[PDB]
Design a protein around this ligand. Sequence first.
Ligand SMILES: CC(=O)O[C@]1(C(C)=O)CC[C@H]2[C@@H]3C=C(Cl)C4=CC(=O)[C@@H]5C[C@@H]5[C@]4(C)[C@H]3CC[C@@]21C
Length: 249
Amino acid sequence: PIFLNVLEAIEPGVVCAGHDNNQPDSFAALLSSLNELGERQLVHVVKWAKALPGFRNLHVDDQMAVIQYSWMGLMVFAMGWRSFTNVNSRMLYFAPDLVFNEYRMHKSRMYSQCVRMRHLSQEFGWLQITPQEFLCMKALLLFSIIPVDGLKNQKFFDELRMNYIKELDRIIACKRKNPTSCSRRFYQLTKLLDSVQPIARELHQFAFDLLIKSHMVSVDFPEMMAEIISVQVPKILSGKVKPIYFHTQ
Ligand SMILES: CC(=O)O[C@]1(C(C)=O)CC[C@H]2[C@@H]3C=C(Cl)C4=CC(=O)[C@@H]5C[C@@H]5[C@]4(C)[C@H]3CC[C@@]21C
């Protein structure tokens, strides 16, 4: 079980936001905490990606680009998994010290996005997604958004993405002998994977908008987050970089 051994081994451990839960649930306090958590996670996201099987095969430039493009989707998906495994998707578990209940969802000003993320988290339960499927799908999300015009080394990327799909295929078939059973599961998993993209798109828009009006005085947005939102996110929003949907949207 080489492939799965690796996925489990490189999976980041718990990361706290450093949020003081005694403070009032203001937009400012929740924003400060979310961003701090964001910057902290990004640190782990980069090391995670670079330790992924075959990732080093990508051109240096494509490595960081791909990481930065899928960043948001990766955080949505993983966050959704933590909510499911920790609080049975009852609340949004961004971190042990930063759990969103109804009031915080409203206070953050991303209530609808949170509700959509809550749905996503519940799909992990309805579909009975295994830790194995979760890990392989999360890795695939890393390879699910690229420039329309292509990456420095597009063929290496396509090769890699294909191999990860093949792995997701092995997972599904490991305990399934009748093809139909397998096809049904693949359908379910690819539909779930797709559903992450629309949510990340809205979060991308929300982040961009906030960065702009925030720049006015408080450019308090962390460094790495600030770089991705000002340099990479617009490429997505303007349509130069797009997600790779499995099914027609
Ligand atoms: C309230 C809000 O706007 O949050 C945002 C901004 C621009 O501040 C917009 C989208 C927010 C991001 C969306 C999610 Cl799913 C997160 C998940 C997660 O596990 C850790 C907490 C972070 C982020 C990446 C969060 C950082 C603050 C963002 C970027």
